[PDB]
Structures are given as structure tokens and as C-alpha cells.
């Protein structure tokens, strides 16, 4: 008869693990990490180098 | 391009998207958690099955 319940679909409750049911969630798992991509260079064969 | 057909398109369009080699680099994520669980039972008053 115990209702597992649902979070409020509020970011705060989801992050904290607040559900409205019997059990309170530890934490919102881990799906991955997203990082900005590193751009490429135009190299330097378009002008002289002469180190 | 991998051209697909949205056969239930409402009027007319085309939508270009991206999908990299990675699963994090998607645009929109669809994360299955519980998948097509079958639940069966019977009603004792009539023994007929419910699925």
C-alpha cells in the first residue's frame, strides 16, 4: 500500500532527492559530463615561420 | 547525411540535426530506465486474465 511517489519535477527536489512517496532518493544518479569542445587551429603554414 | 522520413509529418518540412560518435553529444537524450515490463494478473471473481 506504500506509494513510491514522484518528485515534483522541480530541479531543486530532483537534485536534493525529495520525493513525495515513502522512500527518499539518495541522489540523481550520474548520466555523464559534457565539456565544451576544444577548437582547432589554422596552423602557421599560411605565413612564414622562421623560428 | 542519414536521411529519414517522418511519415506522420503534418504539412511539410525538413530538419537537420547532429549526432556524434558519443552518447553525451546528442542534442536530445532518451534514457530508458524500466523497459516494457509485463504485468499480468487474474480477477478471482471471474478468473479472466488481465495483461
What can you see in these coordinates?
The structure is cut from a larger assembly and holds two copies of chain A (51 residues). By secondary structure, chain A is low in regular secondary structure. Helix content of chain A is 12%, strand content 0%. Chain A is built from one helix and no strands. Chain A binds chain B through residues 31-34, and chain B through 23-25, 29, 31. It is classed as viral protein. Keywords: capsid, Hoc, highly immunogenic outer capsid protein, virus decoration protein, antigen display, viral protein. T4 highly immunogenic outer capsid protein C-terminal domain bound to a vertex-proximal gp23* capsomer of the prolate capsid in two preferred orientations. Chains A, B: Mature major capsid protein.
Which structural category fits the helices and strands of chain A? little secondary structure
Main β sheet profile of chain A = none
Strand content of chain A: under 5%
Specify the overall morphology of chain A.
rod-shaped
Biggest chain contact? A-B, 4 and 5 residues
Number of strands of chain A: 0
Order of helices and strands of chain A: H
Radius of gyration of chain A: 25 Å
Helix content of chain A: 10-25%
Question: What oligomeric state do the depicted chains represent?
Answer: part of a larger assembly
Distance between the termini of chain A: 78 Å
PDB class: viral protein
Keywords: bacteriophage, T4 head, antigen display
Entry title: T4 highly immunogenic outer capsid protein C-terminal domain bound to a vertex-proximal gp23* capsomer of the prolate capsid in two preferred orientations.
Chains A, B: Mature major capsid protein
Amino acid at each position: 500500500a506504500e506509494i513510491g511517489g514522484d518528485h515534483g519535477y522541480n530541479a531543486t527536489n530532483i537534485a536534493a532527492g525529495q520525493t513525495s512517496g515513502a522512500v527518499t532518493q539518495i541522489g540523481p544518479a550520474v548520466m555523464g559530463m559534457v565539456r565544451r569542445a576544444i577548437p582547432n587551429l589554422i596552423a602557421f603554414d599560411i605565413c612564414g615561420v622562421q623560428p | 547525411y542519414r536521411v529519414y522520413i517522418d511519415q506522420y509529418a503534418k504539412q511539410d518540412y525538413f530538419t537537420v540535426g547532429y549526432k556524434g560518435p558519443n552518447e553525451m553529444d546528442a542534442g536530445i537524450y532518451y534514457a530508458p530506465y524500466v523497459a516494457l515490463t509485463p504485468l499480468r494478473g487474474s480477477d478471482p471473481k471471474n478468473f479472466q486474465p488481465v495483461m
